[PDB]
Amino acid sequence: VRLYSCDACPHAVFTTHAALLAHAEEHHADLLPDHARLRRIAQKLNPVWNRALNARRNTITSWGKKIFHVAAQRDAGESKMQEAHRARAQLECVVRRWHDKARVFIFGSSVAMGVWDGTADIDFAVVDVDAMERGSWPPLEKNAVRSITELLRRVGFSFVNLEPISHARVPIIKHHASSPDVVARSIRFILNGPATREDRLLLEGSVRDAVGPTGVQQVWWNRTSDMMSATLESTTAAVRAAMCSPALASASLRTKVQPAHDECRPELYNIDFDLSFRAFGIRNSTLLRKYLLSHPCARPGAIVLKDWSKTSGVNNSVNGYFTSYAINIMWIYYLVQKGYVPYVDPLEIPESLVNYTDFDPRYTPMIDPEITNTEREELYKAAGDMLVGFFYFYSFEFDWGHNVISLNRPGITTKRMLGWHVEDVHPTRYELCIEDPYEENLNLGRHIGVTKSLRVRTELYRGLLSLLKEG
Ligand SMILES: O=c1ccn([C@@H]2O[C@H](COP(=O)(O)NP(=O)(O)OP(=O)(O)O)[C@@H](O)[C@H]2O)c(=O)[nH]1
Ligand SMILES: [Mg+2]
Ligand SMILES: [Zn+2]
């Protein structure tokens, strides 16, 4: 026996879950207007579910085809992924000026999905692995945000694009890219006075030393010897050269540097990114990658569910619903429990970054470029079956009342196992429970109280019904 409280009014507490649910329906139908109705329609299909699957088999397969189409749009090919790799290397040049031993790791979707569409923002983590191993990373993050922001400004980033968020719970730098080849890898040094012949040789030497013996293609000075332009071998070498620290001969002669053109620039200038100083997302993303690569329909399904969850409102973290990360866990848990993919113990992914190699996320095509039409049709059928199965699983099979969506063990996780079978009554909620793989006692559904939970259940019924029809 325990207390249950409503999340839509301050004065409703009950001693049974049934009474809580009844109260949500009876007193807050305005907050969950479609729940009863969609549940009822879905409940009609349950007794004849296999017959429904059989009759709607063509439609389900067509949804499978659409799922792969949507997934294909997010796969912009290996060359596009390598643009992100180059941006990562450019950012690394910059942050090493602040802390020589820091390295840049990409995490998030390009790791988990093995593809990048060229528009999704990129997550960068900046970590000194030695320091992390000593228990001394990150340094004070507010200062790190400010230091790196200044370095980016000095290499040519505008305050219009750079958002330092030094006073957040996790301080980050957000880069907001504006919307709109030799120029892109060219830079310009502006001097505050005329350079002597010796000064000119020293600046060129500084650039040469920064990029190595192949890095500089061309250097030229203006008439008044107070601007030097350089074309480098790559966009990455261009950032590396911009990061040099010239030591000139003339007293007080100084330089400012920026890309030669305001719009045509190295990759880092052109991509939305969040820059953080913590390693947490790396292990996360690597675990998701391992699971999602283990069935050919896993990534396409995850992609369609991310979009579905956003449009249906169940993925909306600022208002306390799920994150895209949590939706990925729901999908993967379903794949594991139904036997579509093998279980992976979260502990199999090392916490330590000492042996890390994949700073640049490995590219894997969304669909095998060399499969037959027959194999492809089998994939569409499977994808449709699996997506329908996901909505069915969470609508009728998964015990939301007593169990937890968890990848921390291969068998059932009960709420009681985690101590989530009782709430301390904006409480931490245990209505819908998803265990975070690496952060113990964190429910990804902790902000989802009873009425919010029924909005979620509404959308699961809606998705189930949608896949059986023209949509
Ligand atoms: O609760 C969380 C959320 C996110 N993450 C980490 O952040 C990464 C991105 O999590 P995300 O929810 O931002 N996924 P994303 O593809 O960027 O979609 P969007 O909703 O458009 O932003 C995940 O892959 C994890 O590595 C966590 O570690 N914990
Ligand atoms: Mg994100
Ligand atoms: Zn209430």
DSSP states along 366-379: SS-TT--HHHHHHH
Q: Give the integer Cα–Cα distance in Å for 258 and 153.
A: 9
Ligand 1 pocket list (CB less than 6 A): 107-109, 112, 123, 280-281, 284-285, 288, 323-325
Q: Which of 169, 304, 316, 324 to mutate to test the pocket of ligand 1 (most atoms within 8 A of CB)?
A: 324
Contacts of residue 38, Cβ cutoff 8 Å, sequence gap at least 6: 458, 461, 462, 465
Which conformational region is residue 114 in: left (phi greater than 0), alpha (psi within -120 to 50 degrees), or beta?
left
Q: Which of 116, 284, 309 to mutate to test the pocket of ligand 1 (most atoms within 8 A of CB)?
A: 284
Query: How far away, in angstroms, is 39 Cα from ligand 3 center?
Result: 20
Query: How far away, in angstroms, is 29 Cα from ligand 3 center?
Result: 10
Among candidate residues 400, 403, 390, 189, the one with its CA nearest the CA of residue 306:
390
Residue type, 324: S
Residue type, 78: E
Helix (H, G, I), strand (E, B) or coil at 305: helix
Tokens read off for 107:
């995490």
| Cβ atoms of residues 78 and 363 within 8 Å | yes
Nearest atom in ligand 1 to 325's CA: 12
Residue type, 118: G
Residue type, 176: H
Q: Give the integer Cα–Cα distance in Å for 471 and 318.
A: 29
| Cβ atoms of residues 217 and 233 within 8 Å | yes
Q: What is the resolution of this structure in A?
A: 1.8
| Cβ atoms of residues 407 and 329 within 8 Å | yes
| Cβ atoms of residues 307 and 71 within 8 Å | no
Tokens read off for 95:
């942050």
Query: How far away, in angstroms, is 78 Cα from ligand 2 center?
Result: 21
Query: How far away, in angstroms, is 172 Cα from ligand 1 center?
Result: 14
Q: Which of 111, 117, 323, 443 to mutate to test the pocket of ligand 1 (most atoms within 8 A of CB)?
A: 323
Q: Give the integer Cα–Cα distance in Å for 206 and 228.
A: 12
Count of C-beta atoms within a 10 Å radius of residue 90: 24
- Residue 187 annotated as binding? no
- Protein residue closest via CA to atom 5 of ligand 1: 281
Strands 403-404 and 413-414: antiparallel
Which residues in 390-448 belong to E strands, given as ranges?
A: 403-404, 413-414
Residue type, 458: T
Q: Give the integer Cα–Cα distance in Å for 2 and 171.
A: 39
Residue type, 258: Q
Q: How far is CA 466 from CA 40, 66, 67, 83, in A?
A: 15, 13, 13, 37
Q: Give the integer Cα–Cα distance in Å for 100 and 207.
A: 18
Query: How far away, in angstroms, is 284 Cα from ligand 1 center?
Result: 9
Q: Give the integer Cα–Cα distance in Å for 355 and 380.
A: 38
- Protein residue closest via CA to atom 21 of ligand 1: 324
Tokens read off for 216:
């500089």
Q: Give the integer Cα–Cα distance in Å for 94 and 55.
A: 59
SS (H, E, C) 153-172: HHCCCCCCCEEEECCCCCCE
Query: How far away, in angstroms, is 15 Cα from ligand 3 center?
Result: 14
